Design a protein around this ligand. Structure first.
Ligand SMILES: [Ca+2]
Ligand SMILES: [Ca+2]
Ligand SMILES: [Ca+2]
Length: 86
């Protein structure tokens, strides 16, 4: 696990991590694929109750990505988005 991320992910409970995994898993054929598309990224975040804007998703992809998102990248993007609630 990349150390920078390791600390973003420390904001999440084991229960949150499991929930987020369950949502993410809807959007991949896990028996052969580890990544969702950038199009699916907003869909999984919205499944989880987040509302990222289109320009935010691109900004996060630019800053977080290591057209695809794996599970740990997705966790970091969820942690970022959870901090913009009002
Ligand atoms: Ca729960
Ligand atoms: Ca649930
Ligand atoms: Ca990626």
């Amino acid at each position: 696990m990349d150390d920078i991320y390791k600390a973003a992910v420390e904001q999440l409970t084991e229960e949150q991590k499991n929930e987020f995994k369950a949502a993410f898993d809807i959007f991949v054929l896990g028996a052969e694929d580890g990544c969702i598309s950038t199009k699916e990224l907003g869909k999984v975040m919205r499944m989880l109750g987040q509302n990222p804007t289109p320009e935010e998703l691109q900004e996060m992809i630019d800053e977080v990505d290591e057209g695809t998102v794996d599970f740990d990248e997705f966790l970091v993007m969820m942690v970022r988005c959870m901090k913009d609630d009002s």
